[model samples]
Target: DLGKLFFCGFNDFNEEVKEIIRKYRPTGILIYPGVLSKEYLLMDFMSFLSKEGDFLISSDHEGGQLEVLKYVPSSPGNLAFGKNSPDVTYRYSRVAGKIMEIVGLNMVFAPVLDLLSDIRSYGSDPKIVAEHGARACEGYLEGGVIPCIKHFPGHGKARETLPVVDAPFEKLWEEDLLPFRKVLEREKKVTVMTAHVRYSSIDSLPATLSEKIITDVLREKIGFDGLVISDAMEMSAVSNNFSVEEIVSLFLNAGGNMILLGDYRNLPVYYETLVKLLEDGKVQKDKVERSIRTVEKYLAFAKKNSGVGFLADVSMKAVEFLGFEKIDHTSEVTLLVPSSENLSQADTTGGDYDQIPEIVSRFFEVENVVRYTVEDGPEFVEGDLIFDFVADIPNEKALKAHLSLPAEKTVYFVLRNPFDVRYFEGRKIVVTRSTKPISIYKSLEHFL
Candidate 1:
C-alpha cells in the first residue's frame, strides 16, 4: 500500500520485475539505460506496465552526460545552451520532452540546477542557470512532460563517494538555491530533487533524510507546494552509511514524496522496511499523507504528449573548435578511440561506440583505427592527420601517456566532458558535449 511513494527501477523487464510490480503496485518506474536502449523493447515494456496498473515513467534525461535515450537526436547539453540563446534551449528542451513522450516516459529528471562545472550544468552564474532551467521546464511542460530540477540545495562538484556540502545556509540561498527558486517562481508545480550530500551546518543527516532541508528549508522557507523527491538512495552517500530501514523511514518522516531505488533486487527489502516502519510508528502518517497528496497534484500536471519530431540544426552553433584545421583529403588518418571499458555515466548512451571509425572513414582517408585503454596503451602510431577522441578517465589517461606524438597534427575531439581537453594545449580541439552518434556526426560533418 505504501509502494506509491517509490519509483522502482531495474536494468531488465523480466519475470522477477513483473512479480515485484504485481506485489508492490508502485506508482512509477525510473528507467535505467539498459531498459531504454532499444525503442521497440521500451515501447512494449511501457505497454505492459500500462496494462498491469497505473504507473508514471521517468529517467535521468539531462542531456549531455546523464542522457538515457539512445535513438533521439543528441542535445549539445545545457552548457552549450548557456553559450547560446534561451530560444535554443527552449527548442532543444521541447525536442527532449517530445523524445520522452516517444519512449512513453511521463517525467524527465533534468535541467541540472547545480552550479556549472563540466557537461551536466549550464553555467556558473545562478541567473544564467536559472534562465536556461526555467526555459527548459517550460519547454518540457509544453511538450507534455514533467520537468524535475535536481540535486536541490545544489551539488557543485561533490561527485566523489560520500560527498558533503559545508556551505553556510545564507551562501546557499544566494547561489546554490537561486536557480531552484527562479524555476519555482515561474513554474509552481515543477518537481525538485534532493541531493545526497550532507550539509554539516544544517543537519547531521544527508539532505535526503534531513527535515531541516526538505521540509523546513524547501517546503517552509521556499514555500514550494510541489513534489519533493529524493536522489537515488542506492548512491554511496546514503546506501553506504544507512540501512534500508533508515533510508525509507527517515525520508518519509522528512516529507519526501518519493524514493528512487536503482536496483529492482533491493525493492522488496525497501518496501517491507517502509511497511514495518509505518506499523511501528517510526514513520509519521501525516508526512506520508502529505507526500501522497503532493504526488497526486504533480501527476495531474504530467500530461503525455506524443508526435513525430526531431531536433533542430542548432547543434552546429554549439560545436566549439580551438586551433582546428581541416585535414587534407589525400592525407592518411590515424583515428584514436577509447575502448568500451572506458565508459562512464557521461559517455554511456548505448549508441554505436564502434561507429566512430565508420563515420570518420566516410569523411577522411583512414590509415588505421586504434582502440586504447589506460591499463594497456596502444602502440605508437602517427599519420598525415591524427584524430583523437577522448572522454572518461581511461581515454584521458591513455592520451596523456602518449603525449610525445605529433601534437601539431593531432585533432582532439572531446566526446563528453569539454573540460578534459585542458590537459593538452596548442593542438586542434573539438568539444561536442555529447557522445551520441548524431552529435558526433554533426561535429564531423562541420569539419568536412
Candidate 2:
C-alpha cells in the first residue's frame, strides 16, 4: 500500500497517471482540487481511481489562506472568527467543506490546529486558535469532510517547518502543546496530521517518522485513536535528510497510520521503497494491516459524503478576515516582493508564479536574496510608506530591511510566513498573511 494518501492527476487523465496508479495502488489521492473549470477532468480522473481503488480523495479546502481549492475569498483566515464568534468559523468552514465535497474532495487537510504566531494558524492565543479550529473542524465534518487539525504538537514556536528544527521540547508541553491539548480535549473523533519537523528532545528523526512524537505523545498520552496521519513524507524536512526506505518503515512501525505524499514523480522511489521494506520484514504485516484498516474506516466516511453538495458563498468577505481599517490612503507607496531564492510556498493550485503580474513600484526595486531576512536594504527609500513582501519569516537582514528604513507607514504584506504578525513590531504597520489576489488587492485597493 502506498499509504492512504498520494497525489497525482492531470488534465487529460493521461496514460502515465494510469500506469502510476496501477503500479502504486494507493488508498486515495490528495489533490489540489484547484479552480472550477479544471475540475471536469479532475472529477473524471478521480472517478476512475474510485473504480480502480475506491480510495479516499482529499484536499486543502479548509477555508482561509491555506486553502487548496482556489479563488474562494480566503484571508485573515480563521483568526477573524477568533475576534467575532465561533459561529463564524463554523459557518464558513461548513460552506468550504460542502464545496470541497461537491468538488470531489471528501477529506480536507485543514483547520490548522497549530498554535498561532505561525501565519498559517488562526490566532494569538492557544484557547482562541483551539476554539475556532475546533468549530471549523466540526463544520468540515458536518458539511461532509474531515478537517485534519494539522501539524500536531505545534509549529508556532518553530522557526521553519522545512529547516530540520531543534524543537523546544523543554517547553513543548508546558507552553506550545496547549492548542493541540485544547482541541483534542474538545473533539473526540477528530483527525490529526503530524509535523515534518525534528524534535531534538525526543528523536533526531522528524515527527513524521518518530513514534515518540506520533504515537507516544500524540496517540497514547493524548489518547487519540481516530486517525494519526503524517504530514507529507516528501517534504524536505524528512526527505532531504534520510533514506526513504528506512523512514517509511520506521514511520509505519511507529504506528504512523498514513503518509501524505503529493507528487507522482517520486512514486517509483516510494512504491519500490515500501515494497522493499515489506519484503525485508522491516515494516511488519500486522502494522500495515492495522494502518490499512484505519484507512478503510475513513474511506468509508469519505465515500458516504462524496455526493453531498455545498455551493454556499465562501467568498472572502472583508469581515471574515482581519484588515487594516486604519491605514486607508497614502500618497506614496513603496512595493516590496520576495525573490524566489529567499523562500517559496509551493502554490496548491499549480498556477504559475507568472500569474503574479509584474510589480510596478517606485520605493522598493525588486531584489531576491537567499536570506532576505538578512538583507541590509533600506539603502534608499522614496515613499510615504514601505510595502514589503516576504516569503519566509523575519531573520536578521529581513528585519533590517524594515528596522533600517524610515517611512510614514509600513504596509508589510507577507505571502505565507505566519510569524510576521508577532515578529514584525514596526510603527504604522498593517500585515496580511495570504498570497491571494483579493488579499493583496485589499491592501493595494486601499493603498491609493
Each candidate's root-mean-square deviation in Å?
16.8, 18.5
Tens-digit lDDT string for candidate 1 (153-239): 889845456787777778888888999888987898588889998887698899999989888988888888788888888988899
Scored against the true structure, residue 280 in model 2 reaches a CA lDDT of: 85
How many residue pairs collide in each prediction?
A: 0, 8
Worst 10 residues of 2 by lDDT: 308-317
Provide the lDDT at 60 for model 2.
Answer: 65
Q: Which candidate is the best by lDDT?
A: 1
Error of 2 at 290 (Å): 1.1
| Model 2: how far residue 238 lies from native, Å | 1.4
Model 1, CA-based lDDT? 0.76
Deviating ranges (above 4 Å) for candidate 1:
157-160, 304-448
lDDT of 2 by residue, 268-333 (tens): 787778777889888888877887777777776663432312111111233122234555445545
TM-score of 1: 0.67
Report the error of model 2 at residue 161, Å: 8.8
